[PDB]
Design a protein around this ligand. Structure first.
Ligand SMILES: [Cl-]
Ligand SMILES: [Zn+2]
Ligand SMILES: [Zn+2]
Ligand SMILES: [Zn+2]
Length: 121
DNA sequence: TGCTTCCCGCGAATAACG
DNA sequence: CGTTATTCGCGGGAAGCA
């Protein structure tokens, strides 16, 4: 088909037949394989760009609307994505958002319609 | 070398299935 | 519907880029 399996320590891995990338979950291998097959297109609704993963397109479109969902809870500045927020917090506040404390807020996406995680409230 | 986008395990929201 | 299968958002590290 589109993958084969490898088993080490009863550990199951799924191997893409084209690039031979490894995945713990088959849904991940299938998500990745569209990159090769393009059986599904994810077109930007704001311009003409096409993406092989839905999440790639979503990040892209958020870039179109200018919405800033990531907010530093130390000083209030907002950022378009995780990386800007994290960079800001590390440089300006000398802290790490992947540590123990909660240092940023991710607001619900409001500038466009995507699935909404209830915990973002 | 610092933005910028990619990657993939994990699991919540939702669609497809009786 | 209730249930299972599927989709895809998210973190945060990695890979790409000029
Ligand atoms: Cl905003
Ligand atoms: Zn592959
Ligand atoms: Zn676009
Ligand atoms: Zn701040």
């Amino acid at each position: 088909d589109d993958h084969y399996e490898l088993i080490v320590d009863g550990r199951v891995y799924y191997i893409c037949i084209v690039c031979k990338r490894s995945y713990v979950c088959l849904t991940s291998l299938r998500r990745h394989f569209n990159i090769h097959s393009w059986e599904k297109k994810y077109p930007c609704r704001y311009c003409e760009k096409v993406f092989p993963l839905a999440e790639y397109r979503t990040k892209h479109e958020i870039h179109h609307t200018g919405e800033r969902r990531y907010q530093c809870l130390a000083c209030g500045k907002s950022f378009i994505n995780y990386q800007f927020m994290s960079s800001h917090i590390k440089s300006v506040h000398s802290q790490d958002p992947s540590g123990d404390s909660k240092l940023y807020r991710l607001h619900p996406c409001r500038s466009l319609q995507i699935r909404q995680y209830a915990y973002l409230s």
